[PDB]
Each structure stands twice: as structure tokens, then as C-alpha cells.
Amino acid sequence: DGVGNASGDWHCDSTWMGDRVVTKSTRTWVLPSYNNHQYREIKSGSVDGSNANAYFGYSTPWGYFDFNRFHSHWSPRDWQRLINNYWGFRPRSLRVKIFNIQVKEVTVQDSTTTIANNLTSTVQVFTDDDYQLPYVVGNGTEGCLPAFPPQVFTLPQYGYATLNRDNTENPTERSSFFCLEYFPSKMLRTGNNFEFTYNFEEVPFHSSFAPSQNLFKLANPLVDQYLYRFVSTNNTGGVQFNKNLAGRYANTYKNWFPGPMGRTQGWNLGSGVNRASVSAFATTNRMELEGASYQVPPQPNGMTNNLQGSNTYALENTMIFNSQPANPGTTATYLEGNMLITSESETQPVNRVAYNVGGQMATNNQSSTTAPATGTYNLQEIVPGSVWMERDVYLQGPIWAKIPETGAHFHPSPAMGGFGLKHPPPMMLIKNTPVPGNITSFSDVPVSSFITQYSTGQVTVEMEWELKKENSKRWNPEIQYTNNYNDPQFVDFAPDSTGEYRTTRPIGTRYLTRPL
Amino acid sequence: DGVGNASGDWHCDSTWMGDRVVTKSTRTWVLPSYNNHQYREIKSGSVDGSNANAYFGYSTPWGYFDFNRFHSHWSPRDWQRLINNYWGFRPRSLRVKIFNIQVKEVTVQDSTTTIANNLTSTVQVFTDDDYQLPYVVGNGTEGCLPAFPPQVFTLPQYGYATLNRDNTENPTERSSFFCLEYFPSKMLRTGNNFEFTYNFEEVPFHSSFAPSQNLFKLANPLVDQYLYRFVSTNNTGGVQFNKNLAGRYANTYKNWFPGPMGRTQGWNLGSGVNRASVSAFATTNRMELEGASYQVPPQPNGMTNNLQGSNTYALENTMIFNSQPANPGTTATYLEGNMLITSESETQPVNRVAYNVGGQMATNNQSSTTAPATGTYNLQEIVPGSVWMERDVYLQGPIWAKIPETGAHFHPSPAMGGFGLKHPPPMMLIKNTPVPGNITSFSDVPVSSFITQYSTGQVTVEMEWELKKENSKRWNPEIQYTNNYNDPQFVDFAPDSTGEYRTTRPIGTRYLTRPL
Amino acid sequence: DGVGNASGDWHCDSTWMGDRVVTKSTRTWVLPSYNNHQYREIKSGSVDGSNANAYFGYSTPWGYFDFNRFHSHWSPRDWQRLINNYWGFRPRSLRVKIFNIQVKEVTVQDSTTTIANNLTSTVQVFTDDDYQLPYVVGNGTEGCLPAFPPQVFTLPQYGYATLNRDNTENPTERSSFFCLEYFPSKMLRTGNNFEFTYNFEEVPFHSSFAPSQNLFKLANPLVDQYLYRFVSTNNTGGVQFNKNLAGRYANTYKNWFPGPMGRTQGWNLGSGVNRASVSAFATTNRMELEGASYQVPPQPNGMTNNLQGSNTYALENTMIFNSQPANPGTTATYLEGNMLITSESETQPVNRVAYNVGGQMATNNQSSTTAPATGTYNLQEIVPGSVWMERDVYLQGPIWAKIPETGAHFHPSPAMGGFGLKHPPPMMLIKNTPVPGNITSFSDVPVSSFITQYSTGQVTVEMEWELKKENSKRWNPEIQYTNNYNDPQFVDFAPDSTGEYRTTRPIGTRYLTRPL
């Protein structure tokens, strides 16, 4: 339309309408001109003594919008309203809007650096709707819409790794290059706006409740089982049985089993002595792939990293966030006091404890001459009639992940939590259209001098979520997420005296309970 | 209606109508007044040297109807008619009826103990249709409708365990209390009756056939494979191949694999020496959960506990029933002569043997200096292209189990056999409405003196089952379940001279065969 | 619309149409960027030796429009036309418009500080229609549309106090943070405008008349009462009566009583000696709240601060304005010559005098041995059959106050005068949308460098008022507000030689009289 008319309005809200809730968020973004308008091939060799660190890829001059964190859509208080009242939820639709664009030209003649706005410049924008480009959004990386609405953010630069050859920096004949200018995009001048809608594919509700019963003790403690059990042999070797009594859960027959587990190492937070001067890496859990060794946090779903009322944590089975945002490439050594360490202790009635052995079993064949022997195991995968709880979602965590296209997968639920999607919300890429400097003669060699500039604008995301109403018959009152602080020095989830947003705790999702 | 009119009739039957069969059972039940009308919080610490035995829960004054045993619906002879002719079956619907109620008041003045009937007293009854209460029915516990129709049974008391804290008797802030009087129930006087219907959710047919072929020998024994195999290296290290010949099953290429296995210990029944003076517990298979060690019979599906024509049994992978019903809390040491030990030997062509190693595999990397080494394994979970047979159903065993609500499970088929249901037949609870004794003054303190009483009545269950017709082209005659006894001293599955029902053998379900 | 077209026109007017009068005001406002775009948590401890001064709250980067002063809508001359002719009035509707916006960018490179206009920048605007935010408008604070139409004003910064803990600067777990960007707002570029309408809820007319009779002397001075009164006891103790004569008002029986009073201290203005070297604070009237002592001017309604034709003023029961506007945070010691001290002397026939005792009453029980004793009181609250006059409204005073939501209040009429409203004219907030400076690299840390800028525009308020026509039968002429000055050196309510607006007197509202 025009220069003196606004292309959209500010919307931040939450509208609860029974079975649905609609969240809206608007933020102000700024977009730098990345790479100075060109593609570069980026690469690395073996860094920090690990060739799993090697890669080969491309950085592009595009930036993208990333809103795959819950705090980008939920306020602390609406999150509390959700986890204290519902049993589950899932995303239904998405609507995005980019508007009020402003391109600024920057000129640094004689160290004066003046910023003027360029009314005729454009930004290009497109969404990759067929998933033809490497999807980098759901991998726990930075650059999402901020938690707090008044914050202004920088869009991150799009880049991707393709195939490297033999754990070195070199490409292979299969490494691909994707040119993003090879997709159709819209061009927007200062009076233009971009709009985009999306519907999620039917996914299972997240389970925002904790189990009120232990999986191995579902039998009625008042009645005995009509099943018996082998309990020994007499002085001659003949077998003897005993009836499974009422409430002797250590012996009853079971119908269901706990989920898969792979033992992780346990460390003590706060009080609780640990081995001094250790170097985690050398002894962490790894998986090999293409000849290299990778750490695999947070480990696959089906375990619990903490046992309620204990300070031992299987740290690599844990999501660890920082209480605040950090600068790029920081190598500082943070301590427990700076972190937001999550705990999955409310799944312990169903998920095995990560730092303990998973059980034991027969190692030999007993005979008149050999005594029965058993041996414990450290890992155990899926068996039939197995049940576990998926990892929890936090307000500061990720909403979805793309399920990789390979044609074969098992139980597509991402290790970091959230929804696993075949076709997730498409990537939205954006860049400042290049504007050439003063060029006076002809050359077949591509132009390399540009006017420096950047853009800024507003972005609105509108998500509809479907809720699963809590339907309990528990008599006594439940546990609820509550604002409880002893002698607060500042309000949590609010700006402090400096104006910086504070958050002292990770807020999970399981407060309500249910009988198994 | 009224005192002198009966509220229902007696129905026991079986109606076969092609693809369906409808069973009806009526029994006479008696209901004691449990706990003297009050809820109690029950609990236990570490019993028998195992804190997996600890719990915290509640007993209620309610009793419930449990008809989750096949012999509650099938006569020995109809069961035989089913397993000798069909390939499978599954439950379709359920209809329950409680009628002809009679409340009796018991007065023990001067050691005379007279029983009179109280025409104005009620029983309360309800079904938990939304599964809001801890479901205790499918956990192999006692108190089901009896096998034999003339038997009168006592309804069991409803109780449940909730969460205990740290393997001790104490509750946690998440432990829940469920008050059952907090549901809507019907009240029945002597002229009233209760009726309830239910439809099962589409489940897979049980497979009542044994495989006529071994899974590893599905190739035609007359033709060779067009695939080759590595057979050695020559004096220089160069690799050599050999064609896979006709009928050399030890080498053919396979497409499918046997199901998951976890080695269990094997013991000899009858003839066959075992290690003398053993104490099973210390070396049985265990799974850890919340810091405690639990035995897990019958182990997960996918194994066979016995090898046909052998007396070695992997006893913990076995369902062991008693030939007769036992008294509550018996600590007697039964011998093989008293038991009904089931055998899954007819799945051996597809399921690995529980007391043997599961296979072996590469442990190193061979080179000119090291010889290839291999190591056996004792457990192996699911892999792709795995096939196994679920555990069999017995006439004296369980029909269904509730699949626990956790949001994540794999292959919901219960270890003890039967159908795994998301929404199983709802629990039916019943209790004698309390009647206060002589109270002459007012008190804010709840009444604690009641008239003692009990009730009795009839209960009819009507189930429709769908059958899968056997469609074989086998030429020679099949194996059938048959009444074969050498010199019977009494008729089996009949009352003896005392009037007590006899059953000398577990009747499984696989007699018919099928080619894989 | 566009850059070269104006978004609205200038309207200043007054249209009298019988029973209604419509006022319109347009002003030019300027809006600074407050706090540099961020929220800050502001707080204070015990200041000036009083912990009632402690608080905890938040300043925001928003500013707001405040038109809750009568002089924002009335000219001195229309005010005179209102108070000389009507008996009352009340507000009926409100219409607001913000237009002709202009955002200016300010750059201070090399001490040149140049101001350019930025055609693409926005201001955000919204009205809090559900009263979800702390309402700070009706609390006698600065920043309203100016009295004189040519004046340009700065919008004040929105801030609020929430709960502090124990009269200290610390918050409590109940202290709330309100993010204003969490409401939906409009964005306006230089061609846009915002419009908003509101209807007041039916309120009682203000009473702009003075009583022509004294409340205790409503009886006809020509007739005696048919009631008698106790006047003494004879030498034996027997009681004696006397008839209440005609016009002896000191004794008649009364039907109605004066309003509530709490004694305030009286000081002499002009001529009239006061105690020398006093420090008011230590002896002013206070109310305790949460453990702290607060001064409570102007005291609750129902008293008169001055007795007509006297120079004694109960200064804390008085509204004291300054003859001119002052700078922020001035600690100057003003003298009577600089003030506009209001007087409520025209309510004296009905309201008790604040610096005098309120009356007296029985303190003992007389008997043959004790003489009747009495004791005066300093405070007396509401009794049944009590009548008083509310405080007057001045041209330089406040129009409305929000009645606090607590569920319980008595006679919601604000101490400072005006209308008390359940749902008052919603707050209108406005801010300059932030525009980021030159950002060249990505960071997850929020942007903190902005282009400095400010905005300006016009604002039009249109209020409809309903009038109550004066309907007197007084014969002789009334008192009227009149422009009377002996030897004027300058015209009052006009700009002086410097161009600054002068106002030498507070203009109340009661000139007309009425018989009680």
C-alpha cells in the first residue's frame, strides 16, 4: 500500500474457549544482511579431539523465523492455567504474519555512521512448504521469538550441514547445495506485508498428568492371586510352590512392563559428594555413526533422570537450560547456581531410573552340580507389553521436531520432548534484497560492492491449541504449580531493576494425577 | 417391584450361531459388610526382606464383581468345542444383571445368632464407566464367578494401592484418595434389579492354532538359493564363498526373525535332577522400578517355557495354577502334584526357548593377527522383521487386562495372556447400605454402631464372542483336545463323592495347526 | 491514508442545547520514549522518616492520556455560565480521537543534534476497556490536557505500585507484573488515526447549589412544637418539663442530623496568629494500613473546612492547588500568596466545622449522689437520618475517580470530589514502537541499541454533559460568580506579557441557593 499507513496491528493475547485456546504473539525483529549477500561453503575438521565435530556445509545470506519454544506463545501465567487444569493438549493450527517492514541504509563516511531509511528497498520472504530444504528448526537451537513481548530480537542466519567425507572437512559426491533464491518468494517494500497459514496433522495429546499408581502394583492389596510361584527345591531337587499373597508386590504376576532404559551416570547436585576433578566426555553415553562417536543427550525416552526427594541426577538424561540468554560462542564454566535443571521424577512410577541397573537375569543352567546364577543388565530396549511416559514439555522448551524421512522409524516422539511431525510448520526465510553500490563500467564479473543495510519489522504468530479436559474423581486436593517463594528479593518472571527479564525455574507440565 | 415377585431368571447356556457364540452364566453371590462400613488406610513396610513389598493404599467397604476368567463363561465341554474347531475368537459384547437381592440382618444376643431378613434394607451398585478409579480387575487376583455353576461365592473387597514414599509405608503428596460414595449409584431393595451393557472395542482375534512349520525353514527343501555365503579365507586371507544348497537350513538367508527373549532359569519337573536345597528368589529375573527390585512373571511375550517332549521348564515364564481354590493367605509349600503347570511348547517353531541363550555375535575385529571371536547373549529385544506368538489363553485363565494410560506403549498384549483393552468392561461395585443401631442422643461425631447385615443375590453375565472359522487343507487328521484318562478313578471336570469340583488339567487353546 | 493528507481537524467548542452541553477540546501532545523502551522495577524504602512511603512497582515505557480535570474541557467563561445557571450536572458520554501523528528521529552525531522525521515509524495505542490494569488516572496526579488550548503538553509515563512486603522495598509472592504489550493495540503510522467512544453509567447529578436554610432550623419560627422537653428536677428530684417554644432552635426536636465529622486542626490564613515554628506532619490526622501511618487529606466527605467570613482553615480538609504548574520534584516552600486554597463555607448550614468538637454526650449515670456529667467528642461517623453535602468540584479539579473493586463500600463518592465510577473512562496508553540501531551479527541476547525518537500529534476529547435546570422562586437576586477585580494589573484567565496563562482563583460550583 503506502509509506504512511501501517500494514498490521499488535496482537498479544490468549483466548480460552472451552476445548480450545488461541494464543497470539507479536514481536519486533531485526534482520542483518548476512555474509554480505553471498553463499559461503563452511566447514570444520576434528575439533576438541573429536571428529564427530567435523562437517561440511553452507551458510546462506538468509535468516529465518523460529517459534518453536513454548514461551514464544505462552505467558508464565497462561502456562500455569494450562498445567493446573488440563490433562493434555496438542497444536491445531498456525497463522503467521510479517508486517510493518522498514529497510534502513547505513553509511559510515568519515566515522559518522548515519542511519537513514531507504523507502524503495525490499526484503524477500518465502516458506518452504514441500520440505525441500534442510529443516533446521527443531534441533534445540537459538533465535526463537523471545519469552518476554517487549524484547527485540535478531533473526538467526540459515545454514546447514550436508555430507562430509570420512569424518573430515571434505565433501562427498553426494553432498548437496541448495540455492534458496531458487524458490519463488515475495518481495516486500515498506508498505507490504506477508501472511501464511498452516494446519497441524492429527497428533496425540501430550500427557500432562503424573501417574497416581506404580505400574508394578496394580493388583488389589486385599486379594491374593490365583497364580503360584516357584520358590525353591527340597533336599532332593523337587520343585516347590507358594501362592502369591495379597499385597506382596515383589512377587505378583505382572501384565505390563516399564519402558526401555540405557544406564546413564548419576551425579549429585547441591549437597552430595561427587568424584572430584572429573572430565565427563571420556565416559559419557555414545552412539557410533559413520565411524565417529557422538554424545546423545538427552538419551531416548522411557527413563526418569531423578528419583523424587533425591539430589542424584542422571545429567545426560536431563534437559539443562540457562536462567538467562547467553552470548554467541561463550566458553564459560557455569555452575549449578546458573542453571534450570529439569526433573522427570513424576514419571518414576512407570519409567526406570537412568542411573540404576535395569534388572537381572539367568546366566547359566542349574543342575545337581551348578547353582543358578544371575547377571544384571545396563540396557534394555523395547519388549512387547512395555509402557513408559514420554518426556515432559517445559515452558522454556521446544514444541515440535520434524520426523526424518527414511521410510522406517519406531514411535516418532522426539528425545527432547514435544510433538514429532511428518510435515511440521514450514520454515520461513527472509533476506534483505541486495542493492549495488556505484558501478560505472561493465564487467562480466559479478557485482561485489553493496549499499549496507538492514531491516526490521513486526511478526505475529497465532496458534490454536486443543485441550483435553481433566476429569478426575480424586477426593483430596491435588498438587498445583504455584508462585511460592520464601522472602522474594524480586518478582520472578518479571523485569528486574535493570529491565532484564528474570526466570528462576523450569516449569514442566505434570501436576495433575491419574490412576494407571 | 415387590417382595413376593422374583426380579429375574436363571440363565446358563451357550448358543452357537455360525460366526458367533453367546455364553450366559448365572451365579449366586454373597456380600459381607466389609470394614464395618468404613474406609481404612492400609499399608505395609518391607516384608520378607523386600521393599518392593511396601505400599500405601486404602481398603473400602465395597465389593466387586469380577468375571475375568474364562471358566466363568465356558464349560469344559464348550471350551473343547471351541479349541478343536476354530482358529480364533474375540469378545464382542457384555451384558450384566444383578437381581433377586436379599438383605439379611444378623443378631447375636446371648450367643443365639439368629438370621432374619430385613425387607427395607438396600445395596448400592454402580459401574465405573469413565475409568476414574484404580482398575484392579485384570491382575490375576481371586474372587471371580466360580467355574462350576452351583457354587456360591463371596464378593471380594475393593482396595487399591496408591503412591508410597521411597519404598516405605508412607504416602507422598501425590497419593490419592478416592471416595467411592462420590459416584452416583443405584439403590436396590429386595424387589429391585440392576442391568448393564457393554461393547468391546475392535481387538485382534486370539490365535488358537499352532504353527505347522518352523520359521527358519520356510525355503523349499528341493531348490537351492540364488544367494551365496562367506565360508572362509584361503592361506593368503582372500575370501571364499559357497552356494546355499537345498534344505541346508543352518545356512540359508532368512527374511524373518524369532521374537524377543530374556533368558529365564530352567527346572526339571517329575524325573530330572535339579540343584538340591535352592531358594529361587535370590536369582530370579527382576526389573527395577523406583529403587526397588520386582520379580516379573510370566516375563514378556515372545518365548516358549518348554520344549515339546522335555521336562525342563522355565518356571518363571510359566502360568502356574492350583488344581483347586485355596484359603486366603496360605503359606503351604505345594509340590508339582498339586499344580496345573501350563506349557507353551506349541509355539516353539516361532518363539525362542526361555532357558537357552538367544544366539551369538561378533565381539572383535579380525585382522592378520587376531582370530574372529564371538560371544553369546542372554537377552534380545525387538528388531525389525521380528515375529512371535502371544501367550495362550487357558480355560482357568484371564480374559482381558486394561492397558495402562501413559500415552506410550508398545504392542499392548498382556504378559498373562488375553486381550489388552484401552477401555475394558467397567468395574461393578457393590455394598450394603449402612443401617444405624439405636441412637438416643445427638452428637456431631459420626455414628459408629450399625446393625450387622449381609446380602446375597444372583448375577447373570451374557457375553457374545466372535469366531474365526478354521479353513485348513491339511490332509491327515489333526490333534484335538480329548478326554483321555487311563483307568479313571473319578470323572474330571465333575463333582466328586464329596461334592467338590475336580479339574486335573489346564486346557489351553492351540490344537489346530496352520502353515506359516 | 497518506503522508500529505491530514488525519483530522481542530475542534474546540461548547454547544449548549437546552438540557445538554457538549464540550470539545483539542490539544497538541508530545511523547518521549520512556525508559529507553524497557520495563524497570522501581522501588523505595522508608523516605522522610515514614515507611508509608515505601513501595514496590514497575515503570513502563508507555505514556497515557489523562483528561480528568475540569479545565481540560471547560473554559473559564463556560464554567461561569454553568455555575450561575444550573443546579447540577453529570457526564454522559465521551469520544476521543488521536490524529496527525508525527514520529521524529533524533541523531546527536558530533554535538549537532538534528531532528528529522521518520515516515515509516509507528506509535502503539490501546485502551484498557476491561479494567485489567492498575487504574492510575483518578488520583490527583499531573499530566492532564492543559487548561489553555494553545499549550503543548508531554504525556506522563505509566507506572504503578503493587504490593510491597512489610513496609519495605521488597515484593511479596502476591505482587503482580503487568506487561502492557500483552494487550492488543493499534499501530499508527503518520497517516493513521485512532478513535474511541465511551458512555458513562447513570450517576447522580453533582449538586451545584448552596442550602438557603440551616438544617437545625427548619421549624416555622412562628409556631411552637407540640413536643416538650425535660428541663430540670425540683428540690426533691422529680422531673419537670417545658414546652418547646416558637423559634427556640437550641431546643426543638430535630428529625435530621449533620453528616460525619473527624476533627482536623485549624490554621489562620492572612491576618490571624498561629503557633510559630510548627512541623505539621507529627500531629496531622492519620489512618493505619498494613502497619504504616498515612496522612489522609482531604479527610472524608461531610465537613466544612472554613466558616464563612473567617480566616481559620482546617487545612487538611482542604484542596490546595497552585496558581501555576510546577516542575517535577520541586521541594520549594510555597506561601499562602502562591496558592489557590479552596473553601467549602457554603455547606456550613449542613456540614459540621472540621476544627471544632462535633458535640457532646452523657458520660455517667446521675443519682442522688452524682451530678450528670458530659463529655465532648472529636469524631463521629454515620448515624441513621444523617445528611451532608459532598465536596465541591472546581474548574482546576478532578472529574471522576474509580471506585475500588473489593465487593464492599459505603457511599462511593470520592474525597477529592467528582463522580465515583464503577467503570470509568478507560485508560488510553501510547508508546513509540522501538526501532533497532545497526545490528550486524546474531545474538540470543535481546537488542539494546535503538534509534532515539519521539512523537507528537493532536488529541481531541468530546464530552456530553447533562444539566439540571435551576427552578427557583427566590425573589431577591442571587449570588453569581463574577469577574470582580479592584484595579487589575492584568486580565485573569488570560496570557500575560510573557505569554504564560494566569489564574488567580479557584472557581467552585455553588452560587445558586435552594431551601432545604
Residue numbers in the entry:
A (entry chain A), B (entry chain A), C (entry chain A): 209 to 724
Per the authors:
However, in the receptor bound reconstruction, a PKD domain of AAVR was bound, at its C-terminal end, on the side of each three-fold AAV5 proximal spike. The PKD N-terminal end was disordered and pointing toward the five-fold axis of symmetry. The resolution of the reconstruction is sufficient to distinguish side chains that identify the domain as PKD1. PKD1 binds to AAV5 near the 3-fold symmetry axis spike, primarily to two of the variable regions (VR) in the AAV sequence that have previously been highlighted, namely VR-VII and a segment containing VR-IX. The C–D and E–F loops in the beta sandwich that makes up PKD1 contain most of the binding interactions. The two AAVR residues, R353 and H351, are of particular importance due to their potential for polar interactions with AAV5. AAVR R353, extends from the end of PKD1 into a polar pocket between the AAV5 VR-VII and VR-IX loops. The positively charged R353 guanidinium is extended towards a negatively charged region of the viral surface near AAV5 E544. Similarly, AAVR H351 interacts with a charged region of the AAV5 surface. Instead they involve hydrophobic contacts formed by AAVR L376 and AAV5 Y542, L543 and A540.
The icosahedral proteinaceous shell is composed of three capsid proteins. These proteins (named VP1, VP2 and VP3) share an open reading frame and differ only in their N-terminal residues. We use a high resolution (2.5 Å) cryo-EM structure to analyze details of the molecular interactions that are presumed to be key to efficient infection and are likely to be relevant to serotype-specific tissue tropism.
